[PDB]
């Protein structure tokens, strides 16, 4: 018997594939409990059809959107002038909150949840880098010069 699964089924299941099974197991258990359907031509073509297509669409859309995000702002530079004092050590330290909306005003619209901070609360006046996680593998690195006003 050549049933097509519809479930996780214990020792043979992978949610819609082809298995060779005994007949008693098929008509007495699998078929009435949901769980399976026999491979009788048209259905196996049709069931496959949408499922195979599904895999192609989701992956491609995700990759493309993320590559596009990585590409965004062409200047790749966000500058900020925050209140400070004499020779370094600024008054109020910026965070990931401040920059998340600052980049919105000058390019990329990335939120607080996707910016990686190796510098922490960034308490230094100099050249800094905020590497974005536009995707799990794609990194969008925008250079930042912090000005001590």
């Amino acid at each position: 018997m050549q049933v097509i699964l519809l479930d996780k089924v214990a020792n043979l299941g992978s949610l819609g594939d082809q298995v060779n099974v005994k007949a008693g197991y098929a008509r007495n258990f699998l078929v009435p409990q949901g769980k399976a359907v026999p491979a009788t031509k048209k259905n196996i073509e049709f069931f496959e059809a949408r499922r195979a297509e599904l895999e192609a669409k989701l992956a491609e859309v995700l990759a493309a959107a993320n590559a596009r995000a990585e590409k965004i702002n062409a200047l790749e530079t966000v500058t900020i002038a925050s209140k400070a004092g004499d020779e370094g050590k600024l008054f109020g330290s910026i965070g990931t909150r401040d920059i998340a909306d600052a980049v919105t005003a000058a390019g990329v619209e990335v939120a607080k949840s996707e910016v990686r901070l190796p510098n922490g609360v960034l308490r230094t006046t100099g050249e800094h880098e905020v590497s974005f996680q536009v995707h799990s593998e794609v990194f969008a690195k925008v250079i930042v010069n912090v000005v001590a006003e």
Partner: protein
Amino acid sequence: SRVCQVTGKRPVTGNNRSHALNATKRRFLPNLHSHRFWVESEKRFVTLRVSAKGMRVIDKKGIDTVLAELRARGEKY
């Protein structure tokens, strides 16, 4: 009577032959079993007296097509 409801298998007749070829009448009987078939399109169990190759042909043709044949030839299920 011992008729398969799918394939229509009556008991037929024959001979016990022996080593001395003595002909005796016998009956060959079908392998009739009373099995309860789930139909998904109706969401019910229709119980039939099938042969054990009426179950083969139900496994191949599907139960719906078979029930359409029984309803077609007036076999009541």
